[PDB]
């Protein structure tokens, strides 16, 4: 019982996000060992996305992704495949023909299916969960006007899952999305999910990205999302969990980056209290959740350091800039003691 994964077995798997640099650099070895000690599930940050894996939709770059999957099997990880079909980080050449004007519905369908057949096929039986479709719902309670939707309709989701289930029938198919605590967006998602599953579409689970803030959203809305998803027939997945502790709502300002010198004790405790309250709800509905994954291991590798404002110093994860366990981490351990 050494890592946080051992404390949370019999409940749900504790995962993290693995960067490409961690796999292709020998000086990032301590990070790899740190992940193997603490987590029992992994998710590729970028190496399995369309553009980084297949730039201009031409030649594949399996190298980075292969080292990821191999690392997972080397430690018996719950390997998650990140993004088969996403609206972002996808080459423009995909949504256009050989002219190239706007591609047709049938031709684009072939591109999506060929991509799935190749990507999911290469790691068939070696990947436990796939992020089939991601962020298909607009935050205003409607369909996202992506090229995927505007051309193939909304049924591109139904086809992506169907194709993936044919390619790798043992993989747990997942629909991922953010802002799932927003009722108007959550209702649209659950409704969409229920409609597809009724039509035979193999949707096994729905992923909550859980890009939460230090203040909100509340644990009540988080709980309601868990209940709504459970009643939808799918399994709950926490996919990209992180806690933004910086003032939000861009241009850099000395006042909106007030923790350059470090994170104060009252902030460390407010963050510890935050993570604790969230996991309290997770443990309450442990039978609904299959996996809880934090988007990164240490604070130095978070995307929130440079987004939405570049140059800031953020503390969203369980480990700090020096790979040391933060009070929030131990706070989560005490829950299972």
Numbering used by the authors: 32 to 280, 292 to 379
Reproduce passages from the article:
Xylanases (E.C. 3.2.1.8) are hemicellulases responsible for breaking down xylan, the major hemicellulosic component of plant cell walls, into short xylooligosaccharides by a general acid–base mechanism involving two glutamic acid residues. Typically, these enzymes can be classified into glycoside hydrolase (GH) families 10 and 11 based on amino-acid sequence similarities. Recently, these enzymes have received much attention owing to their use in degradation of lignocellulosic biomass for biofuels production.
To the best of our knowledge, this is the first report of a three-dimensional structure for a GH10 derived from a metagenomic library.
